Symmetry: D2
Subunit: 333 residues, 4 copies
């Protein structure tokens, strides 16, 4: 089975390898590109503030990591076209740096000798997969594909089930979400976004997201029907997405919950809970999204009805399990 | 006409009531406090505040009093309000902040013990419930026990009133992303019967019920039964935000919504406006009960259908207290 | 052939420590069986707290409940709700050893109520005055079959004692002072407000560095008699959920180098399931879930020397919740077999 | 005297330098700022502060300036100090707050770029290093590049000075339990070659090195080489504490230590005293470089051996900044 390279050995990139080893994937990770020394990547891989000690041995040499006894070449090329993917035969690149989020930009990996790129972020108008929502749209001719955001992977399965069961006419979402590396530790410049410049562990911070606006790449029938944003708050990982919808039918809360429960049955990407969990309970989830029946709310006056549905997601590990499900299929094609 | 206040419950709100009266140089004087602890400990907590920093006035204590800015305040430790000797120092209006007398029936005890009026710092069932600069005109001279609802009501009501007056609210649901409070838990452990309240508040996003929207009708009677909502409690110490998703009575643009809110906030001591990219710590110490944030307005339109999201910040401690004090100063003149 | 050791346990106080006691006993597949729990709350709430843990994540076994029990990994555990230990009906399911985790019975006088209630022995998860007090793999050889009520001291004691023991054995400790930079606990406050008579305990624990008294150093003589009255110290409670670190500054009986100290400490951690060693640049979250009572950190060793005066700073990490619990369980397993 | 200042690095320290200068109505004139960003973003950050709240003065900007309390401040964006055009507005003293010029050879660049003096907001090697009200009398009219050491030095030095003057410090070791800073990481990820600095600062106790004790001899020459120490960085946003364990030259009691420190803080604008049970958030906004805490003094004695533990609080941002400004004011006049 296919050989993989990881560009960007960050929060997502390191967890990609963790999850591939955890599921004993036949994918062989043969090369990693980042901006730093093997010694430092080894330290970051062995010790994780969110998920604890790495479950396999980690060592490094001057130019590689040794993970569970197996060598992974380490490169440090800030420009992707300079990465020597052919040296170890990396055919599929998991693109996790944040800096190649377009077909034009990730073309650099194919120029550098790879066959396919899976981008761990929204990447404009390209094929965009939420596993177990629209992964059947992948085919053998795709070369550059996106798995959208963590938030998309949370929102899409819930929106899909509601639309399939009842029709979504229009809706808006807010995700209350763990802070990430795009934000700031102390108040200081963070590119052009003013709110991103503010101390992330000390604030509720409004944040734009494209999860709702671009949902049509994943669920074409919902194109233009959703908007949304984020409130970034001081938890280290673990997030929750609220969606307020007008549906195509009057419903009860039990009816909505029953429809979602059916959508999560035999569904390794989309979980269900009716337990009164909190964000730390989603840390380490193996789902991309967990619908929370306890938070469903129907507000009605006359023939006007608003439906609020809520799903949790581990924006790090849970999303990564979706990235890996997509990678395994992308690599078989 | 009334000028002497007693505080029952010298907690987060109780202590800030005193701070704010002194800050605005009120003619109302706090003459007595009832709590569950010693003056030494109340002095410590009044002097040193994790959220608002050092108390701006001198504080000392004796065995049975606090001395604040050179003025003596009697301190009692009566667990049952009927036993508080309000008459000794002449406390006329009781600011009821314990959480344990949130009904006209329960707070009657303060009148039984010799006070003239009670202002409850929380929802208290179906009594007159005031958001200052929304419905404080409903107060008259015959009222003896009233509520100022919750911090969340004081955040939701001014925004909902402005939208309803301008456009009509047909139906809506709110979510407040809110600072954790003392009803929650420091470590995972029992907290009465409330499962989510049992979880470590500074390490979790925790869904939480609120009556702010369900009981809005007490403040805006035309919206009775038209709103629902809840909270997501998160790890900030104070400073919160309320999102409201509404179906309005006409099609609107974001600019139209924001300009209506700007007009409702103009020369409005209770209801502020920002179009700056603020975050929750910027609201700490706010002197408003609510601050509408025009940067977060969102209109989602599909044909005849339309969802309007409006967002307002609130300092659930100090900002709310400024509203409690506005209501108190008026309540005391009627 | 083999006469059965005591095997049935009751837990008083199904709190942070009590719930982890059960987790660790199942983890190590102990032959001890928790047959009963006493707390102040319903089975429903205990089952919710056992299943969902903010510090260690989902419980690794099934959890259900009835009106009067928990069902854990298919096994029934009776649940009682007696706030006075003397009233707990320990004899109904035959609880022999009580793991006393409420914080309300920290003396022999108080904890003997469990014996009146039908138990045979009590192990207290906290300092409990001058009773027999065990840090496993430091002084557990002082336990014998006539010990009926025993203490495992505090988390901080189980961190401090193995480091002090190694230093004292190797070099002599003449005098020393400890500061533990420690995760906040349930004795503190979520928001500023009264917390008994302790002023600092009244302040918001997740928003402050908070000085805090501890007896780990002052009572060390119960565990290392030669250091009785030679140590003092305190804690700085800080905003992490679990995971702590203890610094000891000592005058030793000999001049030393940092490498000599680190080597002595490494030797003391060898073949020692209670006491670990690291020379990696770890931080507190790396100790969460530790199976040691204490992990010596060679990277933080510091020798300050002016002439014949010398100060030695030695530092050990500890998971004040799970790491401490592993020590409590090691002591319980031995206690049951004496 | 010189009156015109430039700030290099408009960060946490750089912005608070400006805030404090205005707070104390200094006659110093900040005429220029160099950073890496646009006036728009610098204006936003000056106006809204997560640790100290809203800026007390008006703030606007243009494409190349800030307008603060009505006064124009030029904004440059030169990443190499030698290219900063300090002569355009005649900046004479540079307050060097980037962390990238912490040596005489590095900060020489500001002088080549037209400035007359540099005050570095950090340790900067073997140069004149001032803790105000410990050794500011060593500042000399010919000095042109000076350091104010670290926040931790400004905490440790006044305590060590008082102990050494009264009793003699023979040897000692320090641990500061300290708020996290921008040298650390928000999420786990590379942070130069510094492994512990690479770990999520608001979720960890993180040991780290500090020169505060090792270099104390620059400030208190008799203690050169007599102190060592380090830091534990923990999740509070600002507000820190320093513990010192010492062998003294004299047998002492706690009261004796505390009284000696009390006397050293009397009439001392840089060095405060408390015997209240304060916690870190109570030091936020302090106007001292250091506040000695008598409640934490500990004497451990066995026979003729004695260890003395003394503890001082410090606001590593604003408190240190008040010391930087004191030094700057004196520096400007020499
Ligand atoms: N919650 C999350 O963190 C999350 C969830 C879903 C998707 N994503 C997306 O995944 C991607 C990475 O997110 P992350 O949290 O892992 O960020 P991160 O900052 O933790 O990791 C980025 C890694 O890429 C390295 N890097 C940066 N530029 C590079 C370059 N030119 N070449 C090679 N390496 C480079 C960095 O050293 C770092 O190690 C982003 O696109 C992000 O939007 C993040
Ligand atoms: N914290 C907020 O953000 C907020 C906002 C709006 C309204 N409120 C409401 O104000 C009231 C107080 O809230 P808080 O955050 O200050 O809680 P708190 O726990 O900080 O204060 C409660 C105080 O009352 C004392 N107390 C409890 N029972 C008492 C009794 N029988 N007699 C005398 N004293 C007693 C307690 O010792 C404590 O000092 C509550 O009803 C709350 O719902 C809180
Ligand atoms: N948390 C730590 O880091 C730590 C470490 C070592 C030792 N300890 C000690 O372990 C003991 C428990 O600590 P914890 O952190 O689990 O406290 P906790 O507050 O989390 O648990 C106490 C439990 O006991 C229950 N309880 C209280 N009184 C009771 C009573 N009279 N009868 C029955 N149940 C009662 C409570 O409902 C709660 O569930 C304490 O003595 C503590 O000093 C704590
Ligand atoms: N934060 C504290 O507690 C504290 C206390 C005492 C001393 N210090 C020291 O003060 C200095 C700054 O500390 P800080 O906390 O403000 O750091 P910071 O990261 O908050 O601010 C540094 C500023 O310098 C800018 N900058 C970086 N490189 C630059 C360059 N080449 N040219 C122009 N601008 C540049 C950055 O954009 C930023 O605005 C450091 O030397 C630090 O050691 C910090
Ligand atoms: Cl949108
Ligand atoms: Cl509701
Ligand atoms: Cl002690
Ligand atoms: Cl040193």
């Amino acid at each position: 089975m296919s050989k993989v390279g990881i560009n960007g050995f960050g929060r997502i990139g390191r967890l990609v390898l963790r999850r591939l080893l955890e599921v004993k994937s036949n994918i062989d990770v043969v090369a990693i590109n980042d901006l730093t020394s093997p010694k430092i990547l080894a330290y970051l891989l062995k010790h994780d503030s969110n998920y604890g000690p790495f479950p396999w041995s980690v060592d490094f040499t001057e130019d590689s990591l040794i993970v569970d006894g197996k060598s992974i070449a380490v490169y440090a090329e800030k420009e992707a076209k300079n990465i020597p993917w052919k040296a170890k035969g990396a055919e599929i690149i998991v693109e996790c740096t944040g800096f190649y989020t377009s077909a034009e930009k990730s073309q650099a990996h194919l120029d550098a000798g790879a066959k396919k790129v899976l981008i761990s972020a929204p990447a404009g108008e390209m094929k965009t997969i939420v596993y177990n929502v629209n992964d059947d749209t992948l085919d053998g001719n795709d070369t550059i594909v996106s798995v959208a955001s963590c938030t998309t992977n949370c929102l899409a399965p819930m929106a899909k089930a509601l639309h399939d069961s009842f029709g979504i006419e229009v809706g808006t979402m807010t995700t209350i979400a763990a802070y990430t590396g795009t934000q700031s530790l102390v108040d200081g410049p963070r590119g052009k976004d003013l709110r991103a410049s503010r101390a992330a562990a000390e604030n509720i911070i409004p944040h734009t997201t494209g999860a709702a606006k671009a949902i049509g790449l994943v669920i074409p029938e919902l194109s233009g029907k959703l908007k949304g944003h984020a409130q970034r708050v001081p938890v280290k990982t673990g997030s929750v997405t609220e969606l307020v919808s007008i549906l195509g039918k009057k419903v009860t809360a039990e009816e909505v919950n029953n429809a979602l429960k059916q959508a999560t049955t035999n569904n390794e990407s989309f979980g269900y809970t009716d337990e009164e969990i909190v964000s730390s309970d989603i840390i380490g989830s193996h789902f991309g999204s967990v619908f929370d029946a306890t938070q469903t709310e129907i507000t009605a006056v006359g023939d006007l009805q608003l439906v609020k549905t809520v799903a949790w997601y581990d924006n790090e590990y849970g999303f990564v399990t979706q990235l890996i499900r997509t990678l395994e299929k992308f690599a078989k094609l």
